[PDB]
Amino acid sequence: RVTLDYGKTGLNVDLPDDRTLPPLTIRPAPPLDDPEAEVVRCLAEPIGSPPLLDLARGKRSACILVCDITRPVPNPVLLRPILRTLHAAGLATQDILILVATGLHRPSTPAEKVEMLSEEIARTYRVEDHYGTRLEEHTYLGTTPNGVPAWIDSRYVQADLKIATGLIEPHLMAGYSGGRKLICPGIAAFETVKLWHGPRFLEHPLADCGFLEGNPVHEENTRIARMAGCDFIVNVTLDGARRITSVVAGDMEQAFLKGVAFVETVVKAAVPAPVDVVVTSSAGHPLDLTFYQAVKGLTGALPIVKPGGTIVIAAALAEGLGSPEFQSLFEEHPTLEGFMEAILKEESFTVDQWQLEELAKVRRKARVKFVSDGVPAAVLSRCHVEPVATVELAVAQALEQYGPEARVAVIPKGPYVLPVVDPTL
Ligand SMILES: *C(=S)c1cc(C(=O)S)c[n+]([C@@H]2O[C@H](COP(=O)(O)O)[C@@H](O)[C@H]2O)c1
Ligand code: NI
């Protein structure tokens, strides 16, 4: 018996005893007893930065970037100390903007702003959303040597003091989330993101979970973020129960890399050899709201599935498939092969196509069985996955085609684990 992450509830699955490896879980590092007190200490003694109070001296306006609903950042724990420090430094609440770094996601709703930020903060401060398809809300900062133009939200570019908050987790394109990613793509225009999420970047072998050095995705969003600037970040790591296990604050690159150095010591979980069947999740609520995000559980399982093996994923999909643009791609391209022909041979850019490109990467290696009660089976069957009524049935089906020596690996927390093959085991 194992509980997979699944919406707000989890999902209790019973897996075959003689076939299943010990579940892959991150290492049990100690939660911080008092994370808010730790944030306070880190703002007074940051990495590679003057203390926040001293940075904020004389500043007339501030813009604080926060993640949208898809990241479970405990924002009030980070924001209350920042906002106290800005108040102490003399900035009026009217001089402070909280900007939701949607990337190209839909804007957050009023209720989502309350769940992300707490009612007190959502009712007191101006909280606005980034709109990546509105180029008029962005400022041009230059073009990188790779030819990517940097278009960044003007409210951030024009603020005297620039602050970004976030969460360091594995990411299927950028290696790890956090740090610089709040700027690119968090508040970058489609004119920037369509090229940075284009196939010339995403087909690179190191554009994958856990890779930073040598990953052109990470090299390029670090460069773009530095053309905008960021005076101060606060980033956290979370364990499986969503408790904070580390806080880093300070310089956007040095604090990020310190956070990554810690998370690398807990997120890796190894198997002795790749397996025929991998059971995984999409990390539950809030990540698993849409099929668009649930592709992350599929790419996360790739390193430990055998070529031609099967990934079984459970995801609640409470909000359905994803954006209208994403959904239109399934109608426009009934096969992944035709989709890939379209985007590889010409400069063809549709909002959200990058997650269809990641799904194509998955299906070149593995079959997918998808368990969800959030989208009807008829819809999922046109999304290049096989809907199956239950995880236990999906595993039994997969074990039938692979035979008596086939083994099952299970990753209850899905893409928040970095599964690896270690032959020395
Ligand atoms: C990572 S490539 C990324 C992509 C998008 C797209 O729409 S593309 C959006 N975001 C959002 O940006 C914020 C920072 O991302 P991080 O990966 O959590 O560091 C966050 O609000 C993401 O939802 C990221
Ligand atoms: Ni992105």
Author numbering: 3 to 427
Please give me the paper's original passages concerning this structure.
The LarA family consists of diverse racemases/epimerases that interconvert the diastereomers of a variety of α-hydroxyacids by using a nickel-pincer nucleotide (NPN) cofactor. Accumulating evidence has supported a proton-coupled hydride transfer (PCHT) mechanism for the LarA-catalyzed racemization reaction. According to this hidden redox reaction mechanism, the hydrogen atom on Cα of lactate is transferred as a hydride to the NPN cofactor and then, after a rotation of the acetyl group of the pyruvate intermediate, the hydride returns to Cα to complete racemization. In this work, we report the high-resolution crystal structures of LarA from Isosphaera pallida (LarAIp) in complex with three short-chain aliphatic D-α-hydroxyacids.
Two protein molecules are present in one asymmetric unit, but the very small interface (386.2 Å2) does not support a physiological dimer. The well-resolved electron density map at the active site clearly indicated a NPN cofactor tethered to Lys183 through a thioamide bond. On top of the pyridinium ring, a density corresponding to a small molecule was resolved in the structure of LarAIp. The high quality of the electron density allowed us to assign it as D-lactate (a natural substrate of LarAIp) for the best fit of the density. D-lactate is bound at the active site through polar interactions with multiple highly conserved residues (top row). The carboxylic acid group is multi-coordinated with Arg73, Gln295, Lys298, and two catalytic histidine residues His107 and His173, which, together with C2 (or Cα) and the 2-OH group, forms a plane nearly parallel to the pyridinium ring of the NPN cofactor. The rotation of the acetyl group of D-lactate is restricted by the hydrogen bonds between the 2-OH group and residues His107 and Tyr294. Because of these structural constraints, D-lactate is locked in a single conformation with Hα (the hydrogen atom on Cα) pointing toward C4 and Ni of the NPN cofactor with distances of 2.8 Å and 2.9 Å, respectively, allowing a hydride transfer from Cα to the NPN cofactor.
